[PDB]
From a paper:
Phytochromes constitute a class of biological photoreceptors which harbor a linear methine‐bridged tetrapyrrole as a chromophore. The minimum functional entities are the photosensor (photosensory core module (PCM)) and an output module which is frequently a histidine kinase. In our previous studies, we intensively used the bathy phytochrome Agp2 from Agrobacterium fabrum as a model system, providing valuable insight into structure and reaction mechanism of phytochromes in general. Agp2 carries a biliverdin (BV) chromophore, which upon light excitation of the dark state Pfr photoisomerizes from ZZEssa to ZZZssa and subsequently runs via a sequence of thermal decays to Pr.
Additionally, we introduced a probe at Tyr205, a site that modulates the interactions between the B‐ and C‐ring propionic side chains during photoconversion—a critical step preceding propC deprotonation. For Y205oCNF, the crystal structure of Pfr was determined experimentally at a resolution of 1.79 Å. This structure reveals a very high overall agreement, even in the CBP, with a root‐mean‐square deviation (RMSD) of 0.28 Å compared to the WT Agp2 PCM. However, introducing the oCNF reporter group leads to an in‐place rotation of the Y205oCNF side chain by ≈20° compared to Tyr205 in WT‐Agp2 PCM. Together with the lack of the hydroxyl head group in oCNF, this alteration leads to a slight restructuring of the HB network around the BV chromophore in the Pfr crystal structure. On the one hand, a new water molecule is visible in the oCNF region of CBP, on the other hand, there is a slight shift in the head group of propC and a different rotamer orientation of Ser260. Since Tyr205 directly interacts with the propionic side chains, initially with propB and propC in Pfr and subsequently in Meta‐F solely with propB, one may readily rationalize the effects of the substitution on the chromophore, which is visible through small changes in the Y205oCNF Pfr crystal structure. One exception is Y205oCNF where the nitrile substituent in ortho position in Y205oCNF cannot replace the hydroxyl group of Tyr and its HB interactions, first with propB and propC (Pfr) and later solely with propB (Meta‐F). In Y205oCNF, this coupled process is not completed at pH 7.8. It requires an increase of the pH to 9.0 to achieve the same signal pattern as in the other variants and in WT Agp2‐PCM.
Author numbering:
A (entry chain A): 7 to 80, 86 to 95, 97 to 119, 127 to 503
B (entry chain B): 6 to 80, 86 to 503
The structure:
Amino acid sequence: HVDLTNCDREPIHIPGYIQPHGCLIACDNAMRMVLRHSENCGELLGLEGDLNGRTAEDVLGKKLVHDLRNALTVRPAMLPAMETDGRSFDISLHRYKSTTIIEFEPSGTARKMVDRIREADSVESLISRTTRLVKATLGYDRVMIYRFQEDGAGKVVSEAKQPELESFLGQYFPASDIPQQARALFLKNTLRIISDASGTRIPVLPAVDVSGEPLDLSYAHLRSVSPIHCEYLRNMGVAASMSISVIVDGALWGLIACHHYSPRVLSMPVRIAAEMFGEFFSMHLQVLKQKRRLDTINHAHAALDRFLRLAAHHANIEELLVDSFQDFADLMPCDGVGLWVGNNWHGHGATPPHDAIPRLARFVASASEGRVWATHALSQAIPEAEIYAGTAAGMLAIPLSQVKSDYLLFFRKEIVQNLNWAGNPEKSYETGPMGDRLTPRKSFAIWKETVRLQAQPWSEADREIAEAARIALVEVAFHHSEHH
Amino acid sequence: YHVDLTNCDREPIHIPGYIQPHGCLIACDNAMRMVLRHSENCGELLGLEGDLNGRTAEDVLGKKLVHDLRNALTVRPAMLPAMETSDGRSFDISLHRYKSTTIIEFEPSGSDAQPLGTARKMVDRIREADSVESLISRTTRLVKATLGYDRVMIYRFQEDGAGKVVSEAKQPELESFLGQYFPASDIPQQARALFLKNTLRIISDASGTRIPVLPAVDVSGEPLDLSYAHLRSVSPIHCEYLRNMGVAASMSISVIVDGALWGLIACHHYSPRVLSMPVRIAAEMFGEFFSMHLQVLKQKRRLDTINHAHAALDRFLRLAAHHANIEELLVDSFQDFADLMPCDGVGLWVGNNWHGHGATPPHDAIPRLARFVASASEGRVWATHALSQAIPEAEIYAGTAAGMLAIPLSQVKSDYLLFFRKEIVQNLNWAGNPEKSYETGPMGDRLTPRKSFAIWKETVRLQAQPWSEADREIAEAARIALVEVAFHHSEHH
Ligand SMILES: *C/C=C1/C(=C/C2=NC(=C\c3[nH]c(/C=C4/NC(=O)C(C=C)=C4C)c(C)c3CCC(=O)O)/C(CCC(=O)O)=C2C)NC(=O)[C@H]1C
Ligand SMILES: *C/C=C1/C(=C/C2=NC(=C\c3[nH]c(/C=C4/NC(=O)C(C=C)=C4C)c(C)c3CCC(=O)O)/C(CCC(=O)O)=C2C)NC(=O)[C@H]1C
Ligand SMILES: [Cl-]
Ligand SMILES: [Cl-]
């Protein structure tokens, strides 16, 4: 039995149940024999008796088995409006772990949605409009986008909602809210469908076969839901969901999460459209993200080139840097910047106090090998840094010399200080047996604890810019030494 | 007016007044209410009697078809295969509006597969290519196999607008053009404009009788702008060129990278030939995918090359940190810098002493080069692919070194790391037959591949392959890495 002590390793790929909005037949790798079936196959497909040990041809008929075998030559195959008795079923077909899984549901959207995002020319504009578009088109009560942080936490970066709902915009949930196996399954599958968070699960018969093997439902869209997540949704009032996974650089960037406060499942044709939309969204996001990065790096290069040209006509470089250092804050996101040269401090924005800087400089001198050194958790490196964490919890240090402990220092505030949460601190949630852990309020509190005394991480882009600055300043120092 | 070699650079190829004979064309007002012009063959092709101009579109084409076409104009020219005409027959129709004119183009329908299926089969056979080279090599073979043309080439445009034949699939009896170049002037600016605006250009018959658009010039003195009409007739100049080659027909797919014309996939046939509209739609889809995949592969290759350079320069920095004598280290190491970017030679000029590796100017030539760079550079990288143009005397050694990229090593001494490239003609890898000759027409031998190639060679005589933006970025990284080696050296010694 799953609970809060073991939900981190819950084997959610092998639950032994499906959701009730479809039925499932598992055959051998050659689609010759029925090995397992969901208990609701009889009712849904109009079949009698234990289906296990009947041939696929027997159960499905000659035509359908032929058509499915053909589809299996060609991601699960999605076959809307297949003809069985002359009825229509939307069929999903795949093979995994030497098992053929057939899923049945009783039977230009993509182009229209894509056309409404393809002209977005910033990441911000893309993510803002997508929740609104998806909500209107797919008819869910709420649509959110989460962006995963470096530590795996999710940030709610976009939201469209019914006017009567509470807001989660600007909120974060901890990494632990989505277990590693769920993340694996959100990388492997574009869509995750939950038709009813209070729907009675349908057993796969048998759950464990004569060889002792569970049925791996990793790629089955009907796979049942963890009791943990069902309780979480029930506490929220959510009754149904569908996520579209967002893939950037071959990895899970985040989710488009659609939540409904009553049961809901989109027809397979619409799901296919949503999947196509998701692929386009991911690719457009990646392209916009690349452009933003390029522009930011080019901005830094341009600024540093201006600095190099400026410095060429200054006899006193220390003075120039005392007069100029504040401008370096524009190179990358930061809340403060400062110059530590010849044991003299010059600060701008949110920095540690004057008297704290020696200790920091000493620490970097010990820890660095003459390149950029950066942390988003100062107090972990330097316990006494805790006192000023409110002002400066993260530091990036650019060395100005290999023989002297002189630095250009960038700082960031504790991440909780920069929060822009649109939600309602008064909003409370009912709970079930597992208690308040499974509520947005507690999730948010847990996240805050995970990032206490910490700042926003220095990204790979931030570090590239810092390295550009380091080398630019080396050049300033060198050309000065050449002349003068 | 007659086009010839003196004025073909500005031939108004958008308004020829004719179409090709493999379809017919009707021009209507912007509302598709009235027929304003038609190709002379509309009568024969669509089975219409009487002068078409002045009649309503509904009269000529039937209310149903006009209704459908009007609908399509609401939802690039629209490509509408297998449209049912008033007499029950099927026509593939291309429909667009431009310069307040609606242009309807008709071809008899054949039997065709869905475009998306044809395109998917092609795309599946390139989508797994994981280098630009592999993509480019396989695409001519695939396109030739799918489309059934006698030759398929890919051209990549050079910085100067010249085309290089970078891939070829051909009938065994044909001559090869692989590794050949044609000069920029072989494709006039307006032709380039129309290859940016139109994914496909179709020529069914380079010796086909042109069909007049009636009237060529309307009552108001206006010609019909056929910029986006697929049936638009072909310049006599190019028709002559094709005939000299023995080519009777062609189709090009434009390749768009970073919003501009990267090059073409050019299909040539030695007998009159045209693809069905459904296959043309598939080709367009393939072209779009090809362009995107190329861009992705090109980005990866660039990233790999920059990262390779950074890794090498980082190794050099770490190496230099434990060397008391940096000049000595460079004297022993400089040849390795040739691996940073494409070059035929590299050398170190320090303290009026030369060390060279590969193809470089002679020892005696280096002082003049360094003095020139010193006067021409503001302390950043300086590079040319045309040394003789900067330094007349460099002509003597252009075969060995026609291009130079100079990295300054000091702001107070004219010390440099120099990269060189041979004259581009020296690095040709032409698979063609020097004894292959071409017949000519009235315009003479200008309009032949042999003369095109000779003209190109003249345009790049004494010149090397240009130093690319990537090359220049790598050079800049090397410059600042060497600044850093010098600075840290001064810090400790
Ligand atoms: C130890 C196990 C836990 C757990 C399991 C699972 N969570 C799954 C999905 C999921 N959970 C959340 C959590 C949220 N925290 C918030 O603050 C918030 C909203 C304000 C939510 C919804 C999210 C965001 C997700 C992703 C899906 C979605 O957003 O709809 C999950 C997968 C279920 C499935 O699809 O099979 C499992 C399993 N949840 C916990 O809270 C911990 C204790
Ligand atoms: C002053 C005008 C000239 C001219 C006009 C046009 N050329 C057009 C297309 C074209 N021409 C070439 C030329 C080649 N040079 C070679 O060496 C070679 C093969 C080995 C060729 C084919 C090319 C490559 C192209 C692009 C199309 C293709 O490759 O099939 C053109 C457009 C015609 C149209 O489609 O309407 C015009 C106009 N050609 C000249 O040579 C100069 C004098
Ligand atoms: Cl468990
Ligand atoms: Cl992002």
